[PDB]
Design a protein around this ligand. Structure first.
Ligand SMILES: [Ca+2]
Ligand SMILES: [Ca+2]
Ligand SMILES: [Ca+2]
Ligand SMILES: [Ca+2]
Ligand SMILES: [Ca+2]
Ligand SMILES: [Ca+2]
Ligand SMILES: [Ca+2]
Ligand SMILES: [Ca+2]
Ligand SMILES: [Ca+2]
Ligand SMILES: [Ca+2]
Ligand SMILES: [Ca+2]
Ligand SMILES: [Ca+2]
Ligand SMILES: [Ca+2]
Ligand SMILES: [Ca+2]
Ligand SMILES: [Ca+2]
Ligand SMILES: [Ca+2]
Ligand SMILES: [Ca+2]
Ligand SMILES: [Ca+2]
Ligand SMILES: [Ca+2]
Ligand SMILES: [Ca+2]
Ligand SMILES: [Ca+2]
Lengths: 318, 318, 318
């Protein structure tokens, strides 16, 4: 069902690859083409083995050498590709967490779209890597119901998918109606408990029943009742419940539509999802925006950066 | 044989309880009665689950919210009740360790009265929680034979209880007599080795034989030969060897007898022992002081603090 | 095949030994003879148990007490003997790593002469003890091809010994000839890959074939082509490949030959190897320098220090 666009290279020889990369950087100048052709054709785990063979053969750190030879958005993409998959989301969160400068978009995007199993692993990686508790750091740099909903999601304690109870679907749809549209102001607490903790399959049914009862999609109510970071988080949670690939496809769309490109977001989504569901993302992107993800990247980016992204994405004729 | 006064609540529903606690704190004011009635009727492990459900439902930290709503001795008691049992003794030790301000009474009380199995667990919890070695911190803030005896006990290497060797009982009783009463000055080293390392059952016999030989109880010799912190520690060790519940009952007695109350000690003993031997402690208290622990607490304390302590203790008609 | 000079004492009683050591230090003055006779006759693991029994009996730290009673080179030797074997090499490396003051001789000696299995264990011990990554610290305080070769060795990824391929022996011997003697300047990279990563048994054959082709021993080429720290490291690697005991015997020889003694090196080699191959080292020493290691130590050292070293080494009539 879920498919990435990068898989293990058949006939992999990490030592041969390390030699190719050394040759690409040795002496004056840099062969960026050899680097991007190789690294985009190896899985993350294979990149780690290449880095180990490179240090064994040459006593040099592969990532440090590439940071010395490469520049600009290409360098940023290559660095992202070399982060072990188990650490990459933690790395992005750590870098989003910076006091008044906190990048809420990143916190929202990752925490809303990762499964409880993924969040458990991220929390552990973050603690091991940075010596800090993710929840503590998030709490320190956020406030209000936005913080509260993030903490709920960080518990990674969403109800498991089990048989649907129709009376429970009715009760929760009515509860949301009473907490929002029928209330002067908003009972955010009720929204957070229901959206944060009920099972995915249960909530998909609640969203349909809510539309039946109220005449609004839950996303319309959220825009009507809330604003600011809480609004963006609740929408990301609802969209992820409906379809993580669709939510991430939408995220890529907005990173590219308009003047320039949100390169940070483009790199993060493509790299983080490349071995999970980037294929599904391409399919949702084409369905919803009548263009290929490929053509939009092709139009928005330049140089070796563009070339590497296109190889990672694929789907020329999506 | 050993019985606490708090046990797991039958029919426990952590999510229901979390909702009750939220309702108790939500909005202006605080329902302290609902909080103390619930938390004193749940075991420590159940309190931890309640805290997890509360954060899952509401994205709020239960202990932090209670610290915001509560005040005074009641707050201090509730905070103590919410500490995981596996960390509580380590927490009290950490807080006793403060340079010139070191609270020797706490070091003595805990280290003398905990079993080797308990001390092994405390040492590990302390290291994990605080990133420091307990023995190192104790050494830094104590000196002299007091320090040495604490280090001996911290090794948690007391001889196991095995069949009693009567000639060994004679030898050790005579050794103690020669090291103290018959010596100009005192051979503290000999007292520390024998009291610190021999088995409990062996030492109970040595104490009786020592009385036979010398005409003094070992506690009388200790008062005659030593003073200061070393005296208090040796007495706590001997009393704990005779009966941990009796030693702790005596500790509670002195925390309350006289002007006011040592509230810190009252909270620590009641909470730390509530699921181990607080029932035995009540029994020893009644035996030795002709009053119930309940009535003494009832007489010495006020308000919600008093109410919560009484529910934890029980034994109205001891 | 490999034999130390110190082994477990038969009939070991750690508690009896702890009492002997206490008696040696108790009161004014110190019985250095009782200390050195006992500790040199116990294995490292037995010394650790003695330290534990000493703290259990007396509440005193054995190593700290000995640091208080002893002085000079004797103290330094006793401290080295008490370090757990699993930490000693890490301890020496940590102490060699000091910015501009870095002791390259120690880095070279340990990293060249330890097996991949040993280096894996050292890296782990270092990280656990000091909270730092050994490779990172080495990189910070070294530079150039010297650093690179150290990093290669630190990977502990040397090819396993397997059946010898004669054509591979020819290829590598010719490669080294082309990289050094036939090249204007030197291809250090090629030397580092081959010497750092090929199997020991393969390299022993390459060294013989290299002599056949070039008329030089590889050590002669290294002196002809390189200098400085890289030279010393490549020679230590080649000598260790030929024979670790021989390399370490040579290291001891130079620590003593000439005005005075390199006491730090003498202590490190004797203690670190005492339970691994110090017997083989003695044999190589006698073979290569026509004197006993014993007689050279006897001639170069004084006092209790001399006595303890001689007991550790043995081999009076080597
Ligand atoms: Ca280059
Ligand atoms: Ca170029
Ligand atoms: Ca760069
Ligand atoms: Ca409303
Ligand atoms: Ca409102
Ligand atoms: Ca809005
Ligand atoms: Ca654009
Ligand atoms: Ca309130
Ligand atoms: Ca109130
Ligand atoms: Ca408060
Ligand atoms: Ca006396
Ligand atoms: Ca005295
Ligand atoms: Ca006294
Ligand atoms: Ca009182
Ligand atoms: Ca002395
Ligand atoms: Ca002396
Ligand atoms: Ca000294
Ligand atoms: Ca040359
Ligand atoms: Ca050159
Ligand atoms: Ca030279
Ligand atoms: Ca000399």
């Amino acid at each position: 069902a879920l498919r990435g666009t990068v898989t293990d290279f058949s006939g992999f020889d990490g030592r041969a690859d390390a030699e190719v990369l050394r040759k690409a950087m040795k002496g004056l100048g840099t062969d960026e083409d050899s680097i991007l052709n190789l690294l985009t054709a190896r899985s993350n785990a294979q990149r780690q083995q290449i880095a180990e063979e490179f240090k064994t053969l040459f006593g040099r750190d592969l990532v440090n050498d590439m940071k010395s030879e490469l520049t600009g958005k290409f360098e940023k993409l290559i660095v992202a590709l070399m982060k072990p998959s188990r650490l990459y989301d933690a790395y992005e969160l750590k870098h989003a967490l910076k006091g008044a400068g906190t990048d809420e978009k990143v916190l929202t995007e990752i925490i809303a779209s990762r499964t409880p199993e993924e969040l458990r692993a991220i929390k552990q990686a973050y603690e091991e890597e940075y010596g800090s508790n993710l929840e503590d750091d998030v709490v320190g740099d956020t406030s209000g119901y936005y913080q509260r909903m993030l903490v709920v999601l960080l518990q990674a304690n969403r109800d498991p998918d089990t048989a649907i109870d129709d009376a429970q679907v009715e009760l929760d749809a009515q509860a949301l109606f009473q907490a929002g549209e029928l209330k002067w102001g908003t009972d955010e607490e009720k929204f957070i408990t229901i959206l944060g903790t009920r099972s995915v399959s249960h909530l998909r049914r609640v969203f349909d029943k809510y539309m039946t009862i109220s005449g609004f999609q839950i996303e319309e109510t959220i825009d009507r009742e809330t604003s600011g970071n809480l609004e963006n988080l609740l929408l990301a949670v609802v969209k992820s419940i409906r379809s993580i690939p669709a939510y991430l496809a939408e995220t890529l769309y907005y990173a590219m539509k308009g003047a320039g490109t949100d390169d940070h977001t483009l790199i993060r989504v493509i790299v983080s999802r490349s071995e999970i569901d980037l294929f599904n993302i391409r399919k949702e992107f084409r369905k919803n925006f009548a263009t290929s993800l490929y053509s939009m990247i092709k139009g928005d980016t330049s140089g070796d950066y563009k070339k590497a992204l296109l190889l990672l994405c694929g789907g020329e004729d999506d």
